[PDB]
Amino acid sequence: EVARVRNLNRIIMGKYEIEPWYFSPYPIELTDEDFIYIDDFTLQYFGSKKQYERYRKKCTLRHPPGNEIYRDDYVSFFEIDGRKQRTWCRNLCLLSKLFLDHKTLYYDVDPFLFYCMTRRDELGHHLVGYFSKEKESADGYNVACILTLPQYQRMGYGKLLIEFSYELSKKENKVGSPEKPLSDLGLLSYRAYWSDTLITLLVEHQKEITIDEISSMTSMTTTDILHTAKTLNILRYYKGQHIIFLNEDILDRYNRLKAKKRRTIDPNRLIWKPPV
């Protein structure tokens, strides 16, 4: 007799069988099996396919449990108060931790708002990613953690999540930046977003733009703007203050960007007021 005591080596979520990157503290028994089922609507976890199936038949809504504050032909965003949806949000944090080196205690979700993005097609809503945000951040962080589910990564969804987080800041009349320290993947995604943003402004708005103007239009912090401008070699002094400026390199980058034909967030479709 050999008694196997296995780690969680795969989760089964819809048709996907996904291997975790890191340990997550799912409060489950260790058995001779190395999988659990994650329901793609409720995010509930099950040790057995039969138990999963039993609950799957229950009558449930087929999208995340919050208010739909943005809806276009491609995606929806749902805003969820962690305090009002404790179970679902705890389940979301357990799932997220499988793909993070560290995360704040999964159980305590009350301090957070969760912004969950779905793709909609002929089959309805499919959760593809989220970002969390502190209700009250001492550092003014506009994102706490951000995640695209692995089965959906490298399809452009992460950039949409970032873009949406800044649209909230803009509506709030505040600048913001993601919580640090940031994972390498998280930081490289932000640098690409910040870079594409400055490039797009230079081509579509004005050939020369001040720091104040950029900050007003984007809610990016002075620090993130300057770091991005220096990387692109577009920082100058003109008419008595620092600006970024257009050149041939930027034009070329812009044309390559547009060639990719990627989706963006339409600020006009964000129907939302800050708490006040």
Ligand SMILES: CC(C)(COP(=O)(O)OP(=O)(O)OC[C@H]1O[C@@H](n2cnc3c(N)ncnc32)[C@H](O)[C@@H]1OP(=O)(O)O)[C@@H](O)C(=O)NCCC(=O)NCCS
């Ligand atoms: C950071 C993270 C959210 C990025 O999400 P994502 O959806 O993969 O991001 P995107 O798809 O917008 O961009 C990722 C890459 O895919 C590429 N890509 C996007 N759409 C593509 C397409 N249609 N075809 C090919 N490549 C594409 C992008 O160019 C980018 O490539 P790069 O390596 O040249 O930058 C994701 O890596 C993640 O969830 N990581 C773990 C969570 C984490 O560490 N979070 C930090 C906060 S706690």
